[PDB]
DNA sequence: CCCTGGAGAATCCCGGTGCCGAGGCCGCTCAATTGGTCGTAGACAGCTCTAGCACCGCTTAAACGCACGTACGCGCTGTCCCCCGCGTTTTAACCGCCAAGGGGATTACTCCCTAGTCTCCAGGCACGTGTCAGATATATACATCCTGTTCTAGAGCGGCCGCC
DNA sequence: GGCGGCCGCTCTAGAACAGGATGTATATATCTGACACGTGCCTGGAGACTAGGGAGTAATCCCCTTGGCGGTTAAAACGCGGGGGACAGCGCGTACGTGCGTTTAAGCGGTGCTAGAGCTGTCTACGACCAATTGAGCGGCCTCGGCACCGGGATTCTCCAGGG
């Protein structure tokens, strides 16, 4: 698996900014948003990996993702 | 290795952008596609530990959490843009918002 | 959430109604400021300078 | 005492010149006059020459 | 003679260098203490405060205000300005979620 | 006790902004800083008041303020 | 903290040195981001555009 | 250059299907409920004593205010290149469908070390105290910033020279 | 004899550079006040023991995520037209930087007093635990209806063109 950071497409980031009420979207916001999302995923998925390794499980459940989001003050409901 | 190689409508910018803002702000469905985000999640996870799997619901929760976090970050970025007497966002506004947030 | 559903005139409570109920109330906004609600989006508000 | 007393052209000397730092005071005893504060410091230094 | 007449900004930089390396408390102790007393009077009329409690409140408030001023200055530089503004403070509080 | 919000004087706010590396300080930001400080104190001191009321005490100790700041993610050391 | 105290020509650990040690290390700054340190101040860093 | 009338296209209210997730029902069983019984944390009474509340001298660094001006906040103009709306053709997304095989979930046998005591003792805590580095103090001394004077480069002007 | 072109001369200003100014960096002198060492305990963890219970491990099982396809229409992406806005630049100004006069309260030190938190008994209901029991919560099945979907139609707000 290589070049998967480009899976988050440019109109996907455009629609995400449209949900946030952004009037105009620059052409350099896409790489920065991809980097921010990569950093956030590299934190949350790593925390979920530690949670799964603690429980002697080989696949990561949604509850561990919920715990990893909750421990950083970003708690998620519905899972 | 062995190889040598009549008049169109012409909508002005901003009005359709506000139309999309109104359409997606009242909307509910997920903006980011499923499999590209899932493949990015697997690619990120393979750097930490190999032979790892994610269930469908865990990918769903990660996608919704990331979408909400990026929507809040874009809201703060747009607020800083209007705060800087602008309607176009810049990556330095995103960096400033991340610095203020402490992350 | 029922009031928000009646404003949208829907009978069944959907996560959009719950997200609107949390974000509309100021007390619930302060209580759940660090809370992410799935399948709910955000408030449909527009800045004053955005409209032409 | 007073508000203006200096042997040279005064600058509202107080027994120290106002509007100046503390490292400019001299306490010598000479012939001191007022002359309406050297006629309003020479009518504002020749109206800001 | 003429006065030295420091240009606007040099004494600001001198104060920034002086206070960024000194750990003394900038807010005076008694006015902050009395502000704490009248704030706590709205919740409990018969209440007392230890000296170290006022010390901790003063240090926490000073650190929070210094962080808010840092965010305000960074937002001002982001907004092509060097003067901190109340709208910059409002933006910093809204991004931090305290507004 | 009235009008003690003016006890946070103008040079105190000046020094507070100088610690934060601020070049220029406006004339209208003193009232805004006083309001922000009033809101922060009306949160923290009220939390300490609740702690002291639960602690069967009538004097607000430094420790109660310490966990009152800790519970909001603003933990203070040294008291 | 001892390194910061030697940088300040000090042989006794003062909370200014502890604050400098905490905020200088990136890992300690991220770990103690939600931490208030008494009698420590902040880092003596000045922005590039602030210089004359 | 601004106001007003007519129409293209995204959006909103509405009639009909139905369907697949939501509401109600059958057990029943495992977690919720009832009664007694103690160890025990907790409510209450008296002592106290060490830290906080109120007022006082005083003095002195901290703070309000007024005069002045120059960095900077704000209003205004252009522009061009950066982003948006849309035509078109690829492009991978999602549901449709199929097995797989590691892997979550459950049940049971067993086994070590953790719950809980007994005793003590050696490391941890209260108190006393010589002490050694930090702060006050001040002439001396950095140290960079502000400003005055001069150096040298650039544009404007005038005198001189050749040509028609 | 008149005039354009050329070169020297003086005027003007940007800027490198040196000197004065004032708030800090240091060099002792000396206070000084907690810092850490020593002492005396003494109160909590460690050796050792009793007992047992929840996980390590094995087995099953069934379940659910990954690979792996065509299909098809939603949409990413390339590109043309163009359009309104970020920013360089310039001008107005005022309002906030700098500096002391003057006032004014912050803080150091002192004294008195009680507001009340530990501290020690005391006595008392209260919740974990053990028999004994029991009743609707939940998995699952039957039913059913609210809004996604599909169009149909429509008001309805928005842009383009004409007139004053």
From Swiss-Prot, chains A, F:
The keyword Cell division does not apply. The modification N6-acetyllysine is found at residues 10, 38, 58, 70. This is Histone H4. The chain holds residues 23 to 101 of 103 of the full protein. Core component of nucleosome. Nucleosomes wrap and compact DNA into chromatin, limiting DNA accessibility to the cellular machineries which require DNA as a template. Histones thereby play a central role in transcription regulation, DNA repair, DNA replication and chromosomal stability. DNA accessibility is regulated via a complex set of post-translational modifications of histones, also called histone code, and nucleosome remodeling. GO terms for cellular component: nucleosome; nucleus. There is a cross-link at residue 70 (Glycyl lysine isopeptide (Lys-Gly) (interchain with G-Cter in ubiquitin)). Its main location: nucleus. It is found in: Nucleus; Chromosome. One of its GO terms (biological process) is nucleosome assembly. The modification N6-butyryllysine is found at residues 10, 23, 56, 58, 70. There is a cross-link at residue 10 (Glycyl lysine isopeptide (Lys-Gly) (interchain with G-Cter in UFM1)). The modification N6-(2-hydroxyisobutyryl)lysine is found at residues 10, 23, 38, 56, 58, 70. The modification N6-succinyllysine is found at residues 10, 56, 70. The modification Phosphoserine is found at residue 26. The modification N6-lactoyllysine is found at residues 10, 56, 70. The modification N6-propionyllysine is found at residues 10, 23, 56, 58, 70. Demethylation is performed by JMJD6. Monomethylation is performed by KMT5A/SET8. Trimethylation is performed by KMT5B and KMT5C and induces gene silencing. The modification Phosphotyrosine is found at residues 30, 67. The modification N6-glutaryllysine is found at residues 10, 38, 56, 58, 70. GO terms for molecular function: DNA binding; protein heterodimerization activity; structural constituent of chromatin. Belongs to the histone H4 family. The nucleosome is a histone octamer containing two molecules each of H2A, H2B, H3 and H4 assembled in one H3-H4 heterotetramer and two H2A-H2B heterodimers. The octamer wraps approximately 147 bp of DNA. Keywords: Acetylation, Chromosome, Citrullination, DNA-binding, Hydroxylation, Isopeptide bond, Methylation, Nucleosome core, Nucleus, Phosphoprotein, Ubl conjugation.
UniProtKB/Swiss-Prot annotation, chain D:
It is found in: Nucleus. It comes from the Eukaryota. Component of the NuA4 histone acetyltransferase complex which is involved in transcriptional activation of selected genes principally by acetylation of nucleosomal histone H4 and H2A. The NuA4 complex is also involved in DNA repair. Component of the NuA4 histone acetyltransferase complex composed of at least ACT1, ARP4, YAF9, VID21, SWC4, EAF3, EAF5, EAF6, EAF7, EPL1, ESA1, TRA1 and YNG2. Belongs to the MRG family. Present with 1890 molecules/cell in log phase SD medium. This is Chromatin modification-related protein EAF3. It comes from Saccharomyces cerevisiae (strain ATCC 204508 / S288c).
